[PDB]
Amino acid sequence: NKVYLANAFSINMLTKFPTKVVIDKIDRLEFCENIDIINSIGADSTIQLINSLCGTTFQKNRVEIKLEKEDKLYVVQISQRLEEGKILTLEEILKLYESGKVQFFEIIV
Amino acid sequence: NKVYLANAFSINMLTKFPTKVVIDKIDRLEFCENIDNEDIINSIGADSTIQLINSLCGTTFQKNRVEIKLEKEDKLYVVQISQRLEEGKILTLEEILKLYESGKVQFFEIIVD
RNA sequence: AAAA
């Protein structure tokens, strides 16, 4: 059983269909405790944010993950649709975080 | 029960937790038949994707980059790219057609809770 | 929110 970290969920993470995905929202403390795991976070500002929140030392690792049944995924998620192609800067993602728009999830396949 | 069309599935589409979704893969024909319907709520948020699906399906969608929020028993059809792209990539029509012809544009049906 |  593997555990992954990502900056979004994508259907491209799934390998077999149909599949059921169970999604729960968790708080910062639970997120940080559980990710302190295979990192796929693919944006620099997100790495900086989670390292600051959790005291971790992840580095950007923009790779494809493929989940199997009973794999688990932690997501740090932006709770707003952004402009096309948006890559958030540190200032931008911190502003979103401080406005309640960066949220944390646990996903079981 | 509402039906939506999108260019991805995102956790930001969900409103209540914990929740389940079930995701299944469908082919182009099934996708086109199910979205060529008057009830569907379009959220496709890139121009090339609109042009691609209109060409594949004979539809007349326009770009509508909005937030959808799914409730229990809602259904979602997704057209998406089957590969992780460079950061911030917005595919052109030529690019997305090439991906489509190489098997890298895939179609999904999602049932929420 | 085509893998924020």
H or E segment to which residue A78 belongs: strand A72-78
Nucleotide of closest approach to A4 (CA, C1'): C3
Computed on alpha carbons and rounded to an integer, the radius of gyration of chain B in Å comes to 14
Q: How far is B59 from chain A (nearest CA, A)?
A: 23
Chain B residue with Cα closest to A85: B88
How many angstroms is the resolution? 1.5
SS3 string, B24-75, reads EEECHHHHHHHHCCCCCEECCCCHHHHHHHHHHHCCCCCCCCCCCCECCCCE
Using alpha carbons, select from A19, A18, A14 the residue that is nearest to residue A73.
A14
The structure was resolved experimentally with X-ray
Coil, helix or strand for B15? Answer: coil
Distance CA(A65)–CA(A72), nearest Å, equals 12
Between CA B103 and CA B30 the distance in angstroms is 16
User: What's the domain range around A23?
Assistant: 1-109
Nucleotide nearest to B95 in CA–C1' terms: C2
What CATH number should be reported for the domain holding residue B100? 3.40.50.11170
Q: How far apart are the C-alpha atoms of A6 and A73, rounded to whole Å? A: 7
The three-state secondary structure class of A106 is: strand
What's the number of domains chain B is made of? 1
